[PDB]
Design a protein around this ligand. Structure first.
Ligand code: ZN
Lengths: 381, 619
DNA sequence: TTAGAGAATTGGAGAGTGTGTTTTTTTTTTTT
DNA sequence: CACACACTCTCCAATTCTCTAA
């Protein structure tokens, strides 16, 4: 797209692939193809119709596609906060939100997806945070809840009328299948999109029709939702469902609910302004008095982390029970707490056990889950 | 001659292959004792089926080379195995009669390939692949013998299909007229054929890829054995055929279209007097009613009366307007146990259905007419209420169904029929369905300042049709929360022994309900009649206070239904006072939960009309 | 008297000729 | 258009008619 001339539709070329060159490419991949540019010599009625003109194809000949010291660095017990700092140094604060986002990329015990949602006003750096997760994550998508003229959250069926053969393609949820799907302005989704996300939350697959007949199509992505108030800046006097205007059947699915509220603050505004001005002046982030970890190394870390498979012991189950009932007392006295809350804290504790890279959970895991849920509610309050 | 036959350009001798397969049939006694497949050929004599299923693993273990020849050259080897089996079936049991020659059906138990990795080197091999059926075509009649008749002199002849073509006679042997032999289509002979489109299973797909698909063709006696949506390991020959560029021109595209010539299906996701005496003994067990109500939905906690009402619904009343279908409504906050309970219970009964009240439902509540896509003709697609004509219909998110759906559901619940006058079709479909419902509050939470009808915003014209209405909100008690948390921890620690116990309970519960449906027909005893009349008169005597109405006769009919259901639970076949008192208890508890005005408690007018007296006296 | 070789008549195989071949805007009624 | 129906037209040769020898 960034090589097309200004006022033009992108051009396309048919490539015919034979022998061992087959199965090298996949849809959405970036390739360079060495091949012979040739005309398609059709037969019969098409010959007299086309005359001296002819369609063309590229006869493909070659297709090309465009650690223990590090583990000791990971072994430094700072690594949790080191990673949280490495997450988006362009955004100050919200460090516990960054920890929650880390656990989103880690996931719990296999269910397992830590779906989270973070509401805010327009321009609050909410979109910037979601963009960072989309860039960091190995398999991901970034889209708007509204109304896109592209392929929707679900896949769609294209026609390709030179052949006329209808084929399924894309879908943000489908393309994000094993990873995380980021949705901007989740509140502005259509009802079809809301039901599609509901189906994903329920059973992690969607239904779509090719030619009247229909299939099931697989998508187990975690959802990272960003939503606006229905009108203006968020007012804490109004409850979240009434303010954001989303049904509770969807809004309760997310394990953590954060409110990225923005208000003036002189020194932080000046720091932010200095950051933005340096970015414009030098096209790069200014030095931050620390070095972010390499994203490839973070990907390696979370991969070997996700390969660990924790399990809870019975004493920690009793601890979960006590913490859950006390938290439900607090919620009842101030109601968006249910059995899903117990399952959420279990998921987050197993996610932190994965982060610690140990096959059994511990008291710090349940403490982290409890405080993260509590302080997300505090951020909302 | 058999000994002179060899597969073309292959050096595999047909007679040797036949004799080796006969040796396999003779000697294979050891699947882990007569030979297993000769036991099956003993069974086939009385069973009468025209096929013999054989395992390619068994053939491989008996002889590697025979298995390799089968896999490499099925087109010749499988007919050779058929000839071997039909020779053995008259060497043994020589006096037997069977309407067709036996067809051997080899299969490997597991997939040899996945459909993404099929290659031209696999053409004409025997393969087996796993997949889910997307569509299943009409039964195609495929010709196997062409019957020709002379238009002049009525002389007839028959000619075999060569390779799909016909050797048309060109001149009549009995009168020598050229071009006089005409194909009589309905005197010709045809076999069954069907096209099946198979998609790879979701777990087998790569990350985020759209499905690949393959075309299957299933012929006579194996034709209609699979339906859309099911899963199968399908064994067949990977064919490659040319496709013509245009229907009127014999030029063919260089790229060949491929399909699976199906040989064997194995469905992988579909799955007595001893049962009768076990159920009969279990019916005499003490508190069997509580036992079965507790067996319902093991994952759900404490909802005793809700499960009891669901049990009585699943048993139902006495069939013979005398509607015996019990209607149940579950009511509570979103995310609570009611949706899980519906999704559990719909598969616990035959003829059951589950659907959403919203427009995203896969099968709608209303009947409609659509163009069938594979043939573009009109088809009357009936709704879930009609498809569940003698079962439970589980309607989730009941509250927010649109007005037309509300009206047609009112019609179904009152009349037990669904009338349609859509596209020239005029008919009144039967729907004797038991409606089980799950309704949310209009806002995110239950509002104790308001009663059920005002919270959920459903009409009284629908709410009065329900036999029982239950509230599924949880108490705010710390004891309740702690017990629920311990229960959920136990669910997390659920293991294989608990799974087997739960599945045993599920199996006996299904069998018990089906048997009670099949044989039990409760009828009124004199004490039952007196108790029912007394119950209605007593609950009407409450109306002496405040000059109000406290009951209405459909409450009595509801109690009759519930009493008959309870008698059917205990297999009495006569309903008496024990059943009537349980019916009264559960019905009164349902009204206590549902019809409670916050200002004065239970009041019957809440179900008859919206806006109870404490609300309506504002004006 | 019966059977084979040379000449005559007509069937039809083959060559040539002629002909045939989803996706956007605007409206209308009814659904909420 | 280049690949299939439908029709006409041409000469080859397949079978019978007639004369002769065995
Ligand atoms: Zn004839």
């Amino acid at each position: 797209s960034d090589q097309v001339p200004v006022g033009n539709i992108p051009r396309s070329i048919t490539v015919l692939v034979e022998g061992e060159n087959t199965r090298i490419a996949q849809p959405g991949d970036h390739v360079s193809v060495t091949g012979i540019f040739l005309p398609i010599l059709r037969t019969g009625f098409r010959q007299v119709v086309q005359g001296l003109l002819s369609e063309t194809y590229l006869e493909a000949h070659r297709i090309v596609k465009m650690t223990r010291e590090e583990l000791r660095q990971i072994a430094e017990e700072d690594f949790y906060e080191k990673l949280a700092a490495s997450i988006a140094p362009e955004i100050y604060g919200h460090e516990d939100v960054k920890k929650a986002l880390l656990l989103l990329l880690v996931g719990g015990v296999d269910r397992g997806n830590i779906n989270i949602c973070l509401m805010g006003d327009p321009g609050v750096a909410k979109s910037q945070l979601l963009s960072y997760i989309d860039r960091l994550a190995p398999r991901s998508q970034y889209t708007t809840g509204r109304g896109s003229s592209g392929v929707g959250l679900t896949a769609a069926v294209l026609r390709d009328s030179v052949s006329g053969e209808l084929t399924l393609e894309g879908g943000a949820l489908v393309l994000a299948d094993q990873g995380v799907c980021c949705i901007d302005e989740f509140d502005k989704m259509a009802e079809a999109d809301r039901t599609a996300i509901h189906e994903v939350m329920e059973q992690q697959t969607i239904s779509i029709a090719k030619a009247g007949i229909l299939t099931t199509l697989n998508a187990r992505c975690s959802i990272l939702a960003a939503a606006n108030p229905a009108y203006g800046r968020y007012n804490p006097r109004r409850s979240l469902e009434q303010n954001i205007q989303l049904p509770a059947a969807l809004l309760s699915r997310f394990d953590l609910l954060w409110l990225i509220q923005d208000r003036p603050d002189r020194d932080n505004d000046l720091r932010l302004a200095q950051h933005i001005t340096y970015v414009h002046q030098h096209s790069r982030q200014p030095p931050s008095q620390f070095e972010p970890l390499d994203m490839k190394l973070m990907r390696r870390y979370i991969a070997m982390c996700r390969e660990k498979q924790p399990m809870v012991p019975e004493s920690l189950a009793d601890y979960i029970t006590a913490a859950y009932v006390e938290m439900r007392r607090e919620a009842w006295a101030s109601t968006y707490t249910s059995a899903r809350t117990l399952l959420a804290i279990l998921r987050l504790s197993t996610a932190l056990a994965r982060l610690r890279m140990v096959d059994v959970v511990e008291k710090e895991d349940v403490n982290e889950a409890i405080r993260l849920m509590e302080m997300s509610k505090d951020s909302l309050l | 001659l058999g000994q002179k036959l060899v597969i073309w350009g292959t050096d595999v001798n047909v007679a040797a292959c036949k004799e080796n397969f006969q040796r396999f049939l003779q000697r294979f006694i050891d699947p882990l004792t007569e030979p297993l497949y000769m036991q099956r050929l003993g069974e086939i004599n009385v069973i009468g089926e025209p096929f013999l299923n054989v395992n390619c693993e068994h053939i491989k273990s008996f002889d590697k080379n025979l298995y390799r020849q089968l896999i490499s050259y099925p087109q010749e080897v499988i007919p050779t195995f058929d000839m071997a089996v039909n020779e053995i079936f008259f060497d043994r049991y020589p006096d037997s009669i069977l309407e067709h020659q036996i067809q051997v059906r080899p299969f490997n138990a597991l997939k040899t390939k996945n459909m993404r990795n099929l290659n031209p080197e696999d053409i004409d091999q025997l393969i087996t692949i796993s997949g889910m059926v997307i569509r299943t075509s009409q039964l195609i009649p495929e010709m196997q013998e062409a019957f020709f008749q002379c238009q002049v002199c009525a002389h007839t002849t028959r000619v075999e299909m060569d390779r799909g073509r016909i050797a048309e006679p060109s001149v009549c042997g009995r009168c020598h007229t050229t071009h006089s032999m005409a194909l009589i289509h309905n005197r010709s002979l045809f076999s069954d054929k069907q096209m099946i489109k198979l998609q790879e299973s979701p777990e087998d797909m790569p990350a985020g890829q759209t499905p690949h698909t393959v075309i299957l063709f299933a012929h006579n006696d194996l034709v209609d054995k699979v339906q859309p949506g099911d899963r199968v390991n399908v064994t067949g020959i990977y064919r490659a055929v040319p496709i013509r560029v245009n229907p009127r021109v014999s030029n063919v595209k260089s790229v060949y279209k491929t399909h699976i010539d199906v040989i064997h299906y194995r469905k992988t996701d579909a799955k007595s007097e001893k049962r009768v005496e076990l159920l009969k003994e279990l019916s005499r067990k003490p508190d069997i009613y509580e036992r079965l109500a507790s067996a319902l939905a093991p994952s759900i906690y404490e909802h005793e009366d809700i499960k009891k009402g669901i049990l009585l619904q699943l048993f139902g009343g006495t069939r013979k307007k005398f509607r015996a279908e019990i209607n149940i409504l579950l009511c509570g906050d979103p995310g609570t146990s009611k949706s899980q309970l519906l999704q559990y219970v719909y598969n616990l009964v035959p003829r059951g259905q589950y659907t959403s009240g919203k427009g995203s439902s896969a099968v709608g509540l209303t009947a409609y007419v659509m163009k069938d896509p594979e043939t573009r003709q009109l088809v009357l697609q009936t709704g879930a209420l009609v498809l569940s004509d003698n079962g439970i219909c589980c309607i989730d998110e009941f509250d927010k169904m649109n007005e037309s759906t509300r009206s047609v559901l009112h019609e179904v619940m009152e009349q037990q029929t669904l009338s349609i006058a859509k596209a020239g079709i005029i008919c009144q479909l039967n729907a004797r369905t038991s409606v089980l419902a799950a309704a949310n509050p209009i806002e995110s939470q239950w509002n104790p300042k308001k009663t059920t009808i005002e919270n959920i915003q459903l009409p009284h014209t629908l709410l009065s049709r329900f036999d029982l209405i239950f509230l599924l909100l949880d108490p705010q008690d710390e004891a309740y929360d702690r017990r629920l948390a311990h229960h959920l921890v136990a669910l997390y620690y659920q293991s294989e022994e608990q799974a087997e116990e739960e599945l045993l309970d599920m199996a006996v519960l299904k069998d018990y309900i089906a048997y009670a449906h099949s044989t039990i027909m409760p009828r009124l005893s004199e004490e039952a009649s007196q108790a029912l009349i007394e119950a209605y008169v007593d609950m009407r005597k409450i109306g002496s206070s405040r000059g109000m109405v406290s009951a209405y006769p459909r409450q009595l009919e509801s109690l009759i239904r519930l009493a008959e259901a309870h008698a059917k639970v205990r297999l009495s076949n006569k309903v008496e006072a024990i059943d009537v008192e349980e019916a009264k208890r559960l019905h009164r508890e349902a009204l206590k939960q549902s019809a409670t005005d916050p200002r004065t408690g239970i009041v019957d007018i809440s179900i008859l009309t919206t806006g109870m007296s404490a609300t309506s006296r504002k004006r």
